[PDB]
RNA sequence: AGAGCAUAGCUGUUGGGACCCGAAAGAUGGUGAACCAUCUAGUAGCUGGUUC
RNA sequence: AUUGGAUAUGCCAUAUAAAGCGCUUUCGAAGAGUCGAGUUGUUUGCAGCUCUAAAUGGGUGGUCAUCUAA
RNA sequence: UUGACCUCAAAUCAGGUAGGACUACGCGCUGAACAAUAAGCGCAGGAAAAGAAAAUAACCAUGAUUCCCUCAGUAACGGUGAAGCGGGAAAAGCUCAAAUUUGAAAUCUGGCAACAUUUCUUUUGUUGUCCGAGUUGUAAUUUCAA
């Protein structure tokens, strides 16, 4: 009815039709590959999370839950240690197996020393030994950077390995 | 008592003085800030060491001309 | 539902009472056959249908 | 003006598609963050327990999670809330501790220069 | 709470001079108890207290006129009146 | 620092030093244009805390308005129209006299690369901040329309909301 | 017009002779230029790139926030205030702060001259905090001159409203 | 020194932050009827009311009229003898402003009213205290500014059903509102409680 | 399992905890440097015309008029009382120095 | 020794334009005292009409 | 064909660096013609006009609680 | 004097940017009649605005904003008419000013020269060098939760 919409009705030019209407189809999963392989495309995200043994919400659900078949003290809260949790599904075991193995691969946290770092700490040790780090930090001539005892201790530790 | 009277001020019945130093006449002997001195003021500057390592890197990569080879290019 | 302005898009006014015609407002202007044609009412052609 | 609710079933579908859209991006982690357990602030409701906004700093310190780590593993922090009693502290410390038990944190690759 | 002994001492301490006349002290209590006893009928009580107030006013006016200080307000004497422009318009 | 001394001196606005400078500069500003460029802010403490940085892309403009709507709101709008290519950041009071109130307005160039590459003022480049002073989004504009948090500060009550099942 | 004493004091500046002697000491302690700083750093870069511990630098202190913090810390031996700061209230407290902290101070002419010492267009205030052992007597003689030619002089004049 | 040209009774009228239109309406009224009162600005504090004694000494007013506002819904007028003395706290009910058309008691402004108090004030020793403080304040003493020698108004006071009626007459002067007693203290806006009305 | 049970109750037992002081509640506390800055500026800036008049009345022992003028200018009593005390110490320090 | 609660329909009633057609407008903003557009479905105790 | 976030892996990596946690015989800055007061208008907020601040201070609430504006 | 600095101008100088239109929704200003009313004027975006408490409360306390339901046709006011709590949708937090980098303006725009890169020969950067900005203060660090 609008003059702009009537204009394209009176024209011979076609509309910029875009066929995008696709309801009832759910978003496809990316991110985790393990979840993607075991994710079915028909079920809801609640049904898929429950099937894969995960939790969609760590809180309450603000409604009913579907029922398809009929069913057949501060010391002990602060000093306690919960014993993790079992994996109910092979997917959760697969997720857990990957996390531990990958963390083991990426575990080289200790660092070596560079040419300057090694010569720096080596010169301090040759004069003050290896146990007196407090007097090591107080020597202005050799400790030019004024590293404290804790930094010099970490330098020596990294040199040992 | 306050006698409920009036003090003749109720509504009912040097333009250019000299400078006065009432605070700066004396001299404060101690520093104003008691905060501890950081170690950065007794050690070589870490800002320059950042640039030195950055310059030393690009010297290895050939981004900056070294002083010896700067002169050769000039002549 | 019908449009929120159908039967009221035109402009008209009541010519008066006693002029040998119904006092329903008649579209003003000229040149078009709308001159004198009634609107803003269920009975009048191109008028507001009762209780849209 | 009269507000009509003909888009009521279309808002329901649109909101559900957002949950599915959100879950596709973040595949295995929960679609919501864990919320604390608090008590409403009236004599009419102080017996009830409901969900809060985030965990206090004193609750996170007891549980062993720092306030910078907490946001990265889906634990909200409420800098405003405080624990005026030991029951609120322990009720939500256990809530964090249970959450950490059921949590798998996938490792991240770290940049590691050659020396130094 | 309701310490009669303490209240009585306060009343005597702050009591106005009894020697001051009704016109002098600008206070003359009603001769009889106020007739405004109709709590529900406030309008009737307002008229009931009107008779008691006027009777006290009339009795005091005679007392006020006795000790000079003309009780009747002189119309010629244009003394300041608590009659605001809005208040006078609202009254009429 | 010196901004502690500058900002505590700005509280004694009728002291001997401040009164002499108020009257000397008010005469000077009246000889200039109604809206004139300022080489540097006359209150470097107040501009600095309102978001001004001494760098390219930050502009200070002075404007006088007649005394007798909000005076500061009109100064922001008039300067914004005068410099249509800049974004009004903030504004403040610098001076006044018996007739005029003098204000300085901080503007930011959304096209300068020193602004577009600075993440702390990068937000003003977005088109949603076009003429902030015109829509009451500045500090005085927000205050003018009573925006705030608390009991001290329509459409959803003049409408009938009819649900599907009612 | 009539000016307050705190602004009137800036019209009484240090004399030409003492100011010329002051800048002889200042010009010995100029900060190194952007070019000289780059040359020194690249020289140490080559000694690091190939293969390889100094003394504390010496220079004049500049910057309004920096100098005021040095006076409050009593680290400044001599503070030289520009006489023509465009907003005067930037340095209008400095003579009083220097009096309170016992810092020998002077008001010198041409803020541009102060900037030239530090390779800048303009400096509101310069401050000498601590100089080499060779210049201890030269700085001490300057501080005594500033006491006589600036503090002993004026003084009674700086408490009077100027102008008019 | 302490004062010159002494007046017997001098009041001090104030209000607290948040007073509504009707509360400040009556405050504008009571200032008009008694001219020996001083209208001051709002009081910043709400639990440091002992400063009203300092304010009173400043203006040499022996009576204080603090129209305190609580929750922006109720008015608690405090009447007190400024030097030591007792403090009485009345709640205001059934407001009647000057602007209302029922206002018909056109009396002479500043004219010394004749205050008539019912025996209900004399029934109890504490109600006698209320009568005395009400009498001294509302009654315009001789020698005050705006005072008039002619008498054109007569105040009639009565505690009916345990709650005071303000029935000042010229015909109703215009202020008709309840003065419900609450408590009375031994000091000026302070001191231990000696009366609870209940 | 992670899950919040909303409603009912959790426990009527109570044990009040002592809370520390938050940093925001520290606001208004005077600093050693801010007190120094204000003393320098107050002397440097001078005094307002109404502060000069108030200082004159205090010098002539007319404190009743001084407090009235301060309240008429500033607006409230506790602002007037604070200003009078500040200006009285200025006079006392001036007398000790001069 | 509690009879309510919810929905549907009927009827009555009060608001909305409120059974329909009807009474000079007024106001805002424009065009050349006038003209035009909108508020407007303005205001009706009254007029005429109101369907097997 | 154009793209997004991940995964795997090669190379590079200015780390003499940069962080979180922990502990204290050391420190800890917090926005003014604004707040506020009087008064006059618009619709309590806002606005004008006159005046104009403080530093455990100031705001809002019921001595206490809560908040930390410009 | 040379010469720096501050100004005041100029250039068909280089690189930019604003206007007008739409305006359903949005944010300001203004305003009659029969009410933030229509109009009138100003300004945006795909949403806008609001927004991480100078907020509620009086409890076993809550915890940015926004929207829905409820509170509620209630308190209050003089027929108008909320809000706290409560239930949902969604959730995310942060950045400056006020500190001496002072053992080193560590920061940035631009010109030029190379090297890349592209929704793109159309885009967007990197490195080097020089000039300018900047000490009347640009980075790092800090924002009270500390």
Curated annotation (Swiss-Prot), chain B:
The places in or outside the cell where this protein is found are: Nucleus, Nucleolus; Nucleus, Nucleoplasm
Q: What does this protein do?
A: Component of the NOP7 complex, which is required for maturation of the 25S and 5.8S ribosomal RNAs and formation of the 60S ribosome.
Family per record: Belongs to the WD repeat BOP1/ERB1 family.
Subunit structure, briefly?
Component of the NOP7 complex, composed of erb1, ppp1/nop7 and ytm1/SPAC890.04c. The complex is held together by erb1, which interacts with ppp1/nop7 via its N-terminal domain and with ytm1/SPAC890.04c via a high-affinity interaction between the seven-bladed beta-propeller domains of the 2 proteins. The NOP7 complex associates with the 66S pre-ribosome.
* Protein name (record): Ribosome biogenesis protein erb1
Q: Which organism is it from?
A: Schizosaccharomyces pombe (strain 972 / ATCC 24843) (Fission yeast)
Gene designation per UniProt = erb1
Portion of the parent chain present: 101 to 258 of 740
Swiss-Prot record, chain C:
Q: Where in the cell is it found?
A: Cytoplasm
What is its quaternary makeup? Component of the large ribosomal subunit (LSU). Mature yeast ribosomes consist of a small (40S) and a large (60S) subunit. The 40S small subunit contains 1 molecule of ribosomal RNA (18S rRNA) and at least 33 different proteins. The large 60S subunit contains 3 rRNA molecules (25S, 5.8S and 5S rRNA) and at least 46 different proteins. uL4 is associated with the polypeptide exit tunnel. uL4 interacts with its chaperone ACL4 and the nuclear import receptor KAP104.
Its UniProt miscellaneous note says: There are 2 genes for uL4 in S.pombe.
Q: What does this protein do?
A: Component of the ribosome, a large ribonucleoprotein complex responsible for the synthesis of proteins in the cell. The small ribosomal subunit (SSU) binds messenger RNAs (mRNAs) and translates the encoded message by selecting cognate aminoacyl-transfer RNA (tRNA) molecules. The large subunit (LSU) contains the ribosomal catalytic site termed the peptidyl transferase center (PTC), which catalyzes the formation of peptide bonds, thereby polymerizing the amino acids delivered by tRNAs into a polypeptide chain.
* Domain-related comment: The eukaryote-specific C-terminal extension harbors a nuclear import signal and delivers the ACL4-uL4/RPL4 complex to the pre-ribosome, triggering uL4 release from ACL4 and incorporation into the 60S ribosomal subunit.
The gene behind this protein is rpl401
Curated annotation (Swiss-Prot), chain F:
Region of interest called Disordered, as start-end residue ranges on this chain: 134-153
Q: Which GO terms describe its cellular component?
A: cytosolic large ribosomal subunit; nucleolus; nucleus; preribosome
Keywords, alphabetical: Cytoplasm, Nucleus, Ribonucleoprotein, Ribosomal protein
GO biological process terms, semicolon-separated = cytoplasmic translation
Alphabetical list of Pfam families matching this protein:
Ribosomal_L15e
The protein's matches in SUPFAM superfamilies, at most eight in alphabetical order, are given as: Ribosomal proteins S24e, L23 and L15e (SSF54189)
Main location class: cytoplasm
Q: Which GO terms of the molecular function aspect are on file?
A: RNA binding; structural constituent of ribosome
The cross-references to SMART domains, in alphabetical order and at most eight, read: Ribosomal_L15e
Q: Where in the cell is it found?
A: Cytoplasm; Nucleus; Nucleus, Nucleolus
Cysteine pairs bridged by disulfides in the record: none
Q: Which family does it belong to?
A: Belongs to the eukaryotic ribosomal protein eL15 family.
Its function, per the record, reads: Component of the ribosome, a large ribonucleoprotein complex responsible for the synthesis of proteins in the cell. The small ribosomal subunit (SSU) binds messenger RNAs (mRNAs) and translates the encoded message by selecting cognate aminoacyl-transfer RNA (tRNA) molecules. The large subunit (LSU) contains the ribosomal catalytic site termed the peptidyl transferase center (PTC), which catalyzes the formation of peptide bonds, thereby polymerizing the amino acids delivered by tRNAs into a polypeptide chain.
Miscellaneous note of the record: There are 2 genes for eL15 in S.pombe.
Q: Mind telling me what this protein is named?
A: Large ribosomal subunit protein eL15A
Curated annotation (Swiss-Prot), chain H:
Role description = Required for biogenesis of the 60S ribosomal subunit.
Q: Does the keyword Cytoplasm apply?
A: yes
GO MF, one term, reads:
rRNA binding
Give start and end of each Brix domain.
9-190
Q: Which gene encodes it?
A: brx1
Choose one Gene Ontology CC annotation of this protein and give it.
Answer: nucleolus
The subcellular localization recorded is: Nucleus, Nucleolus; Cytoplasm
Where does this protein come from, organism-wise?
Schizosaccharomyces pombe (strain 972 / ATCC 24843)
Q: What is this protein called?
A: Ribosome biogenesis protein brx1
The answer to keyword Signal applying to this record is: no
Q: Which GO terms describe its biological process?
A: assembly of large subunit precursor of preribosome; ribosomal large subunit assembly; rRNA processing
Q: Which family does it belong to?
A: Belongs to the BRX1 family.
Which UniProt key words apply to this protein?
Answer: Cytoplasm, Nucleus, Ribosome biogenesis
The organism's taxonomic lineage, starting at the top: Eukaryota, Fungi, Dikarya, Ascomycota, Taphrinomycotina
